[PDB]
Amino acid sequence: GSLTEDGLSYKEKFVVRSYEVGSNKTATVETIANLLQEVGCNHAQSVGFSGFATTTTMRKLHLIWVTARMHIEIYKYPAWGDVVEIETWCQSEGRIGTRRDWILKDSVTGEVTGRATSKWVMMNQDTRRLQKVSDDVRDEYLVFCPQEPRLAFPEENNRSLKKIPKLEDPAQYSMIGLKPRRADLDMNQHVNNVTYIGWVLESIPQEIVDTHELQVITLDYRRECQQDDVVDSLTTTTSDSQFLHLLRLSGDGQEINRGTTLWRKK
Amino acid sequence: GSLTEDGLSYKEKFVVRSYEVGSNKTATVETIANLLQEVGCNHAQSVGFSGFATTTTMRKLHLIWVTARMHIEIYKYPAWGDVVEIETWCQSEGRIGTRRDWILKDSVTGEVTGRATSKWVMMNQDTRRLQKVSDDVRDEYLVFCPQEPRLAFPEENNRSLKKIPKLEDPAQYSMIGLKPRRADLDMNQHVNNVTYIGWVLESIPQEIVDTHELQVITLDYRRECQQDDVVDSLTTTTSNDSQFLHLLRLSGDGQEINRGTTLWRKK
Ligand SMILES: CS(=O)(=O)Cc1nc2ccccc2[nH]1
């Protein structure tokens, strides 16, 4: 991997692994999500940051970057043995936080096979309180981002910025009692954000998975699943096939995630 | 990746990923297991086989290669960003089946940081019945294996060939109600063999994990966990070092799926 000529974006190639593919022998959306996360960490390393991509000033204030929303759109999933190239860049969206974008390409043809966007906020790692981005912290990141707007999703009022509603009981489909295992944790012992995508998809029936391909997934992150927590995954068809998703703690029903998926007939 | 000069073994390098490491910021044993599986799959591809590594004759008879035992010994876990190089080769052990071995090295120093061995059997994929390797099928593989014995574990009576006993109730520690999710399945919709290693380790207390490093793991594969099965993971201490006896069984009737042992060293 490497920063591009201007040093304002990062590129990396990946060869799709045998354990990374589904029944179609093409990379799963969780593998795609893990590769986006990997190129994001490598971009942070290449410029001196750090998976919290922190400055020494944020480390002193116990401040970290946390994902608020992830949106992924796949046109063609890379097959087993194929090389996929991913370009990524960050951009501030005012005091709200930062946006990280990705573009996925086929290394052979050069065609865009997918794109992603994510919204991040600044949080005190202990109090879990959002303190919003200050000027002296903002200025430390501005030299690693382009000044002109560079958007993976430029269309006005696109799918990535749509408001997601709360699923109402009874759900059409459900997957109950989901628990994370040690392989679901990251290096800081927190549940990896990709696990939540997997948990959302657990409530999609096998008939949909076998006859359709996932085109779009949008996920909101509200609360973390704290290791010894149990998750319920709820899904209702809202339609192509569209679904509304809800992740909640098995006990009291506290919301952890809300999302939507769009699927195309094979 | 590539076959070595003699075409009798395969080598591949891997850069350790951020999501592949644990709390020590070094590759987990499940990441190591996935990388062993990947270089095994790439060795099969490089010579014409197709993750069952079958010949057209085995495909006609509905025969597959299935793991009976996996044994991994790690001296140093590769850190995040490090390149690890893995060499792998197969060798027949008569009509019983074949053995796949691995040697893990640090690409910078060249020192062996780990090694692994596995025993595989031929099974009919429909009836699940085992049968001895026929001479016509055996001959198809002989040209891709060395003739002289080449062992990752040559030792007189090494840990890789020790018989594992059945854990007796009550277990000291347990992790109940484990279920696989879609990411735990392979391309043929079966539970990936690496998931079982993860399930065994789920019953090790967090105090052991935080104060020790896993040195050896030996796992026997007896029965598959199907998509809709639920697993109970049982562990009892059997011991400077800490040793454990492990059992994976179906939550309901208590049918055994795996039995294993781990050895851990103080940090
Ligand atoms: C919310 S974030 O994307 O983790 C913050 C960030 N902004 C960056 C700019 C360049 C390199 C790494 C960067 N990490």
Ligand SMILES: CS(=O)(=O)Cc1nc2ccccc2[nH]1
């Ligand atoms: C049970 S096994 O070891 O997966 C069968 C096998 N034996 C091989 C020899 C060379 C290349 C691939 C090979 N696959």
